[PDB]
PDB file of C-alpha atoms and ligand atoms in Angstrom:
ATOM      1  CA  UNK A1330      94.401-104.627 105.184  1.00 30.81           C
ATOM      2  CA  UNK A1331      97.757-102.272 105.493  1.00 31.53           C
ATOM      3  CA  UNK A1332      99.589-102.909 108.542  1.00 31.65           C
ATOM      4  CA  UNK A1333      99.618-100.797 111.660  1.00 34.48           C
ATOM      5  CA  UNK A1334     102.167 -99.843 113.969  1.00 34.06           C
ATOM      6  CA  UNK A1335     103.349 -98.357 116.408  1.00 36.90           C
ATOM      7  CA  UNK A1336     106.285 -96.174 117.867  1.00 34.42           C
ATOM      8  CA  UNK A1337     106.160 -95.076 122.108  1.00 36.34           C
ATOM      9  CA  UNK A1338     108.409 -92.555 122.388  1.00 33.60           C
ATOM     10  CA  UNK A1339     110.630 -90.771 125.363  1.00 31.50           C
ATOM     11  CA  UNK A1340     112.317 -87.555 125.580  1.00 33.80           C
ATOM     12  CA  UNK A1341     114.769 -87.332 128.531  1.00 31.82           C
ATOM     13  CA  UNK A1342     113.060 -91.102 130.097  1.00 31.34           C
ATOM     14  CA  UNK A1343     109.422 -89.137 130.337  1.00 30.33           C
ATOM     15  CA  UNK A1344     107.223 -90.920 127.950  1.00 32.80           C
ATOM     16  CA  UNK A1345     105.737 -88.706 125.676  1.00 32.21           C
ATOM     17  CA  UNK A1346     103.001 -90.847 124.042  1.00 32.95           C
ATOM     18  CA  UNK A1347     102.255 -93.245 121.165  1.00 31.26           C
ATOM     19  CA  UNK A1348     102.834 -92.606 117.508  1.00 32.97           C
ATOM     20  CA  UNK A1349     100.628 -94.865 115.285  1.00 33.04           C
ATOM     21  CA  UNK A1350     101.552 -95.374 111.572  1.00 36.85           C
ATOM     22  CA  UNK A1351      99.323 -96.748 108.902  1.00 35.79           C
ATOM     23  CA  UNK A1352     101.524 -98.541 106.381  1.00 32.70           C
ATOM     24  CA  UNK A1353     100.355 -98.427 102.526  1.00 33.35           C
ATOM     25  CA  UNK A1354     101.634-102.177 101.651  1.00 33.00           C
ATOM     26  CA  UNK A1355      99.055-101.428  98.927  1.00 32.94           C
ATOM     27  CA  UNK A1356     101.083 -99.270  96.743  1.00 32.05           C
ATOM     28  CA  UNK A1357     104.536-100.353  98.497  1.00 33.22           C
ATOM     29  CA  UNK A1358     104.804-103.369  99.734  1.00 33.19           C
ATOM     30  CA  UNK A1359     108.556-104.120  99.975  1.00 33.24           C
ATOM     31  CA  UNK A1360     108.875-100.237 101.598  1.00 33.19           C
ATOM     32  CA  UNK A1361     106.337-100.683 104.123  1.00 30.53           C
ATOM     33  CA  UNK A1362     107.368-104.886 104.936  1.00 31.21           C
ATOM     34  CA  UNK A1363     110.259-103.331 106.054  1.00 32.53           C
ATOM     35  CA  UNK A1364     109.292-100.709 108.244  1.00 30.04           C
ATOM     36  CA  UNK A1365     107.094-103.198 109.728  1.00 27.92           C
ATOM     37  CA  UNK A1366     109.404-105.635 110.332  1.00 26.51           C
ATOM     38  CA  UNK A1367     111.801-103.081 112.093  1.00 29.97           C
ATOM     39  CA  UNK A1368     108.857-102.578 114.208  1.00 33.66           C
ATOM     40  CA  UNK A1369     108.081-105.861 115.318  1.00 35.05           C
ATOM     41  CA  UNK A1370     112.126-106.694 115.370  1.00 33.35           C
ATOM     42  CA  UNK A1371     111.600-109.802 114.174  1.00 32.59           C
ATOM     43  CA  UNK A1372     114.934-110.257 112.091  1.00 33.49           C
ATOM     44  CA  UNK A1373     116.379-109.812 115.044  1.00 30.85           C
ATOM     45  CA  UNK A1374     117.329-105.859 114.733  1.00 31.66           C
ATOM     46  CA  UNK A1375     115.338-102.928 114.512  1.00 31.51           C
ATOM     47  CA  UNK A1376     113.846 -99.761 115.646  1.00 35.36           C
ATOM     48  CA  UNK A1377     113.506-100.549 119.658  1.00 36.59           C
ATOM     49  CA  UNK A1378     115.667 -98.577 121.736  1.00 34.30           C
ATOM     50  CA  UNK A1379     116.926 -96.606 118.954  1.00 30.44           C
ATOM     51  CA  UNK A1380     116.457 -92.160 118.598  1.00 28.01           C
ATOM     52  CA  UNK A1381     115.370 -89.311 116.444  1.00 29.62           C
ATOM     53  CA  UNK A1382     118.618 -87.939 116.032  1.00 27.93           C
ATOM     54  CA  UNK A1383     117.334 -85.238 113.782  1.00 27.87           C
ATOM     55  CA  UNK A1384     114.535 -82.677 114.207  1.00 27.61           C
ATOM     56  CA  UNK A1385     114.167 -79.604 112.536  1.00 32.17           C
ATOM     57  CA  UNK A1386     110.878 -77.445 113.742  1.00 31.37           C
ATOM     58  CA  UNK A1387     108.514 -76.897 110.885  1.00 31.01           C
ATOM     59  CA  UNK A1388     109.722 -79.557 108.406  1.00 32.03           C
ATOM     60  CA  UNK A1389     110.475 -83.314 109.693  1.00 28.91           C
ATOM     61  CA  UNK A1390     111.362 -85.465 112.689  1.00 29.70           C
ATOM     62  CA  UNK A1391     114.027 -87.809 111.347  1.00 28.81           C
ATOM     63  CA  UNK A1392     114.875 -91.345 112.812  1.00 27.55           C
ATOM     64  CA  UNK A1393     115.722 -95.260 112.066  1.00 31.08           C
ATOM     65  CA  UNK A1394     119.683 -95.128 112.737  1.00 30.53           C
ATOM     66  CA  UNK A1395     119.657 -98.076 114.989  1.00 32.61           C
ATOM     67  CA  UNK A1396     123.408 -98.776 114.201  1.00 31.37           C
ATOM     68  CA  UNK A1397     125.099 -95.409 114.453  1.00 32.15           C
ATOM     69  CA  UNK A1398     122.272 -92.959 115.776  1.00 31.28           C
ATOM     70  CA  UNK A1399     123.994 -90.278 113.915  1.00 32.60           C
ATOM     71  CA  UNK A1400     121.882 -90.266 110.166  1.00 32.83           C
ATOM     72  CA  UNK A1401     125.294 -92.439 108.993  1.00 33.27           C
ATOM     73  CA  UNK A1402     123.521 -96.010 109.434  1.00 32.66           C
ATOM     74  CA  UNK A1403     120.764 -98.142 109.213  1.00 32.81           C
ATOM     75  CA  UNK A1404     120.186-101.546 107.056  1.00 32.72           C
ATOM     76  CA  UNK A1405     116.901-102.897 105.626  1.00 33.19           C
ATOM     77  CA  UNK A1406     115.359-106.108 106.227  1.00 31.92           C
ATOM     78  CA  UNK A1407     116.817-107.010 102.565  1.00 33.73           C
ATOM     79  CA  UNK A1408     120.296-105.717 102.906  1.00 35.62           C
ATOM     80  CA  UNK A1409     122.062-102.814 103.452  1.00 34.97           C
ATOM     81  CA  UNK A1410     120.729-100.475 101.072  1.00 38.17           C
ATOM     82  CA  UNK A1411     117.524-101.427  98.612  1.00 38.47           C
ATOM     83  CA  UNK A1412     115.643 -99.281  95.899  1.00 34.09           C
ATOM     84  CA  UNK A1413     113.100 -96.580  95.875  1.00 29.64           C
ATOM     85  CA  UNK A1414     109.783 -98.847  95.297  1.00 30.97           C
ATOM     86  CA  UNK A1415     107.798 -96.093  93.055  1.00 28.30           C
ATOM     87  CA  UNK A1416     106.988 -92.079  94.220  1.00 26.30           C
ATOM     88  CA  UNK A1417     103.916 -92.333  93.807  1.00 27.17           C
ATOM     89  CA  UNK A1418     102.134 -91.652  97.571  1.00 28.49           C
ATOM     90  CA  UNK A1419     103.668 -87.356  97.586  1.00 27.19           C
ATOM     91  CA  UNK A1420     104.529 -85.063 100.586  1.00 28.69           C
ATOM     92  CA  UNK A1421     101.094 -84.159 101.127  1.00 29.71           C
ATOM     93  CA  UNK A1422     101.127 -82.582 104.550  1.00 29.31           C
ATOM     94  CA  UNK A1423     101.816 -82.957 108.250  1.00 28.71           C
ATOM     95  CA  UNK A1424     101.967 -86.705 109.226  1.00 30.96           C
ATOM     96  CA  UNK A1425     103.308 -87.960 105.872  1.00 32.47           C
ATOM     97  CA  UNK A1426     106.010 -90.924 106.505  1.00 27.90           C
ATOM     98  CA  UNK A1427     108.678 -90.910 104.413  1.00 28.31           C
ATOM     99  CA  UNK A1428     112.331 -92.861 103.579  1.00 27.63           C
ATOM    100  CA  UNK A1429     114.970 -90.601 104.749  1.00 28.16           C
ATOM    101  CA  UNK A1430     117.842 -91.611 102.420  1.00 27.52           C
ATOM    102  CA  UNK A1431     121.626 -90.596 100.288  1.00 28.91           C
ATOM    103  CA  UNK A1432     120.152 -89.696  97.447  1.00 29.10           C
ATOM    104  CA  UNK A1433     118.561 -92.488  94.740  1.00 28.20           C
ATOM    105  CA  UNK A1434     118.087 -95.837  95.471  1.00 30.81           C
ATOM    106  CA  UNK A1435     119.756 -95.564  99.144  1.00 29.92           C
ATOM    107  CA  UNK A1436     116.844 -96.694 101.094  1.00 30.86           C
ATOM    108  CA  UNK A1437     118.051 -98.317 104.443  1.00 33.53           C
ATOM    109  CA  UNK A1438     115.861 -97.944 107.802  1.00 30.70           C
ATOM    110  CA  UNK A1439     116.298 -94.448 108.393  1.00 33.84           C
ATOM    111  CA  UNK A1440     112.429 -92.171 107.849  1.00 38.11           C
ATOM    112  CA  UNK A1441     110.946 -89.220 108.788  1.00 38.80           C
ATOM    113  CA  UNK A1442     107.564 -87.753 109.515  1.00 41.60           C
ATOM    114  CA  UNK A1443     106.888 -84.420 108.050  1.00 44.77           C
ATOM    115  CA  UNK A1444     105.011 -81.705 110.221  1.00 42.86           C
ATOM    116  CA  UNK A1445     104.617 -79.937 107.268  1.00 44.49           C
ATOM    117  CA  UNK A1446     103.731 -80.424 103.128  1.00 41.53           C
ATOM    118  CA  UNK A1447     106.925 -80.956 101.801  1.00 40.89           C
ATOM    119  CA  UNK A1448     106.514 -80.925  98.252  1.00 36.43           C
ATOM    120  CA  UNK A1449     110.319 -80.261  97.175  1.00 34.10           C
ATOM    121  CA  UNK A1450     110.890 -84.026  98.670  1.00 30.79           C
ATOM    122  CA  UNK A1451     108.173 -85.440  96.028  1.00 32.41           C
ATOM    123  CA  UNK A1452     110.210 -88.183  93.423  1.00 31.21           C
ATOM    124  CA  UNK A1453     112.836 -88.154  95.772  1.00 32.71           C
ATOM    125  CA  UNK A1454     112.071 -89.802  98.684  1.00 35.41           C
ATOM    126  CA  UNK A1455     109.704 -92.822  99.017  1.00 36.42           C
ATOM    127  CA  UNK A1456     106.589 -92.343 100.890  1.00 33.84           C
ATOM    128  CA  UNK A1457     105.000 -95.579 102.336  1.00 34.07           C
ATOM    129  CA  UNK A1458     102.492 -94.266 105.122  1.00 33.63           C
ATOM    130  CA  UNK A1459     100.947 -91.625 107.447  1.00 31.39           C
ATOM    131  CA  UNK A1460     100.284 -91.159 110.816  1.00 32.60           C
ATOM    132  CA  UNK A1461      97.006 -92.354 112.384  1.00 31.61           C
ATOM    133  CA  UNK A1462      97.136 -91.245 115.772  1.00 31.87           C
ATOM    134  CA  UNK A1463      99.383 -89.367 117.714  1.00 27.05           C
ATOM    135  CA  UNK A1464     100.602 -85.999 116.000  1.00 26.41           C
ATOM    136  CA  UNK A1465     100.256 -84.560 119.704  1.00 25.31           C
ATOM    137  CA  UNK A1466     103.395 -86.741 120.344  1.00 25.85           C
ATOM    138  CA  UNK A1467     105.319 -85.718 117.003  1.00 26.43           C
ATOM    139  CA  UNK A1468     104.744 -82.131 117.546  1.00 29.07           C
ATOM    140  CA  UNK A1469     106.376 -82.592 120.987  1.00 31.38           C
ATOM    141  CA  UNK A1470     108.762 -84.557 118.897  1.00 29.65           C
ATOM    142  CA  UNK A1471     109.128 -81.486 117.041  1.00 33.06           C
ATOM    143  CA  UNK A1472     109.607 -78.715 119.827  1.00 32.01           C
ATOM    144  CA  UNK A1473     112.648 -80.448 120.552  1.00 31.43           C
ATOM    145  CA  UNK A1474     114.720 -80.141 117.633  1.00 31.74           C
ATOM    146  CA  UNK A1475     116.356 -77.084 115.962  1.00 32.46           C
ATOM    147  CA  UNK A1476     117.237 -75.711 112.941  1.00 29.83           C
ATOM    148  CA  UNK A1477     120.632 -77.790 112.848  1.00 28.65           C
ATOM    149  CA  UNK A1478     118.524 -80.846 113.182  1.00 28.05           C
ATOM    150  CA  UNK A1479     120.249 -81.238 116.735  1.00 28.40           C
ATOM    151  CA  UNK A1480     117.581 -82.233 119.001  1.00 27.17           C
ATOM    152  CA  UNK A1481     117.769 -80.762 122.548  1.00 27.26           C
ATOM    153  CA  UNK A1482     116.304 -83.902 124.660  1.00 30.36           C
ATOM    154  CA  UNK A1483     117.071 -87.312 123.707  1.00 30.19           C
ATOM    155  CA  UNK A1484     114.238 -88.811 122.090  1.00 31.63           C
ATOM    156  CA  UNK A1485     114.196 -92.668 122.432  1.00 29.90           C
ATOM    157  CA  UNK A1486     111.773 -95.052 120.982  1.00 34.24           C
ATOM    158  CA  UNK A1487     111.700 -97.090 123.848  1.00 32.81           C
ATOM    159  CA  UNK A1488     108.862 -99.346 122.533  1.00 31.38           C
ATOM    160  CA  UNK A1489     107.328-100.415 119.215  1.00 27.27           C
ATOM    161  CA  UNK A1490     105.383-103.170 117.338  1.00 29.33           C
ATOM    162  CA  UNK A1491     102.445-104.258 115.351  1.00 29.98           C
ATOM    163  CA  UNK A1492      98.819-103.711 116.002  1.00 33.53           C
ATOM    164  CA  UNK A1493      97.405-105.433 113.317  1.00 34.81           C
TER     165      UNK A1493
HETATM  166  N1  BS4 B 789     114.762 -86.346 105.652  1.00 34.37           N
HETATM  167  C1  BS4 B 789     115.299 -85.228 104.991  1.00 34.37           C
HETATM  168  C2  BS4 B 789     114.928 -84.931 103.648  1.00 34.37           C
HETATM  169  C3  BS4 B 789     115.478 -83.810 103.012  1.00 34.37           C
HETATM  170  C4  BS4 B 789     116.403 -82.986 103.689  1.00 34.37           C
HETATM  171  S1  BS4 B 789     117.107 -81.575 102.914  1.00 34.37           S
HETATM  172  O1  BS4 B 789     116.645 -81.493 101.467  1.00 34.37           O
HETATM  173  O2  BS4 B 789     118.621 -81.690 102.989  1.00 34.37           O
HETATM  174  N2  BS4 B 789     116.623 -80.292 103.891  1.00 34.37           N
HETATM  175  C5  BS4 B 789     115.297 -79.825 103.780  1.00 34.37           C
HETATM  176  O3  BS4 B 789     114.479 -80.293 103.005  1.00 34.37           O
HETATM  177  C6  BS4 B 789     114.938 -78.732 104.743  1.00 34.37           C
HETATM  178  C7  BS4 B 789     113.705 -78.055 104.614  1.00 34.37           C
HETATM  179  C8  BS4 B 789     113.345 -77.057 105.539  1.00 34.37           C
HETATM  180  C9  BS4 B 789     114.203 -76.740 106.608  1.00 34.37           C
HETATM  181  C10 BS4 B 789     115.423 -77.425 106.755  1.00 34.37           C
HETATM  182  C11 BS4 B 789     115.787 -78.421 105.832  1.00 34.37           C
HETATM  183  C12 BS4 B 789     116.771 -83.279 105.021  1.00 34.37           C
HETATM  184  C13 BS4 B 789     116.226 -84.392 105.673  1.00 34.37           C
HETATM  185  N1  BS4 B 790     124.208 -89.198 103.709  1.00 35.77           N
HETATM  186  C1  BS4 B 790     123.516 -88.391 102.784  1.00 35.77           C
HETATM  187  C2  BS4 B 790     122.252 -87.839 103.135  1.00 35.77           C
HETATM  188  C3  BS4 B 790     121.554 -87.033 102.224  1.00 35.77           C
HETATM  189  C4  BS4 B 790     122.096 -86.778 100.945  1.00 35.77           C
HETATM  190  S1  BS4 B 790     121.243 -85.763  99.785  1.00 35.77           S
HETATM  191  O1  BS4 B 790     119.899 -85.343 100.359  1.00 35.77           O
HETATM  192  O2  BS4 B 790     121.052 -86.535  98.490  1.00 35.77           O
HETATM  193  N2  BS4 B 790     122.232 -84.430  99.505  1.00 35.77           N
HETATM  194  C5  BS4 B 790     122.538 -83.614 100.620  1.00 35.77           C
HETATM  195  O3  BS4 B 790     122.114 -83.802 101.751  1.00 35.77           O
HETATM  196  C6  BS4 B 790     123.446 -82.465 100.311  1.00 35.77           C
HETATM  197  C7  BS4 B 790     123.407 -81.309 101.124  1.00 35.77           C
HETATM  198  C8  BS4 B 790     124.263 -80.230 100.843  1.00 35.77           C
HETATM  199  C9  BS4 B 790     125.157 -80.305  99.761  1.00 35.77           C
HETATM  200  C10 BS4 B 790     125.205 -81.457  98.955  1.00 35.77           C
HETATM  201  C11 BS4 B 790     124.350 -82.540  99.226  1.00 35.77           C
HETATM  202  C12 BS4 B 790     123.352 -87.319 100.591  1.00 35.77           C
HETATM  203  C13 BS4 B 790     124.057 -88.127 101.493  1.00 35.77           C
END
């Protein structure tokens, strides 16, 4: 079946909890391969150690810059940059997991999970799974951003991986 995964986040070195992600390989397989192999880190880079560098209370927790931690960076399993796979999974509601990217066919490693429906974002960003367990931990996630995005503890994924 679709992978899942996992994220264990920190905020100022106090863990905060597990975020688990269901993956829909089903309707996009090369999106979610390579959010799952960022999780694992098998190519040798990815998503351990690395921050949400932007949070912005009531829309999205933003994260996946594992070169530059600053929304600047990023690189896919595949390359640098590779294309939007299809829109058709939508901003439905809190929990959605979605590509962050520069606009069309930009994807790199950098996502987000919405806390809220963010319907404006439909057939522009790629969505490729949902949470599963854990929005306890995202909406702590959430509490510590801002409406800059600037988040006001730093919030590490310290750990992540594949649970099956
Ligand atoms: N990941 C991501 C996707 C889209 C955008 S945005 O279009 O530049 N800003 C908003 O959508 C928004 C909505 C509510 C409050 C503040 C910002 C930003 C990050
Ligand atoms: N790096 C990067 C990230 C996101 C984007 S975008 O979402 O396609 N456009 C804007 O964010 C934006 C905001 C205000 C004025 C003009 C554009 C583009 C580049």
């Amino acid at each position: 079946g679709n992978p899942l995964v996992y994220l264990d986040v920190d905020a100022n070195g106090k863990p905060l909890g597990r975020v688990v992600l269901e993956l829909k390989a089903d309707v996009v397989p090369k999106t979610a391969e390579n959010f799952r192999a960022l999780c694992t880190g098998e190519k040798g880079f990815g998503y351990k150690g690395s921050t949400f560098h932007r949070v912005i209370p009531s829309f999205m927790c933003q994260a996946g810059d594992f070169t530059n931690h600053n929304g600047t960076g990023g690189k896919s399993i595949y390359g640098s940059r590779f294309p939007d796979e299809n829109f058709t999974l939508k901003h439905v509601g809190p929990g959605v997991l979605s590509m962050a990217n520069a606009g069309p066919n930009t994807n790199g490693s950098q996502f987000f999970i919405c806390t809220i429906k963010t319907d404006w974002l439909d057939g522009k960003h790629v969505v490729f799974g949902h949470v599963i367990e854990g929005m306890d931990v995202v909406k702590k996630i959430e509490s510590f951003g801002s409406k800059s995005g600037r988040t006001s503890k730093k919030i590490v994924i310290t750990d992540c991986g594949q649970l099956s």
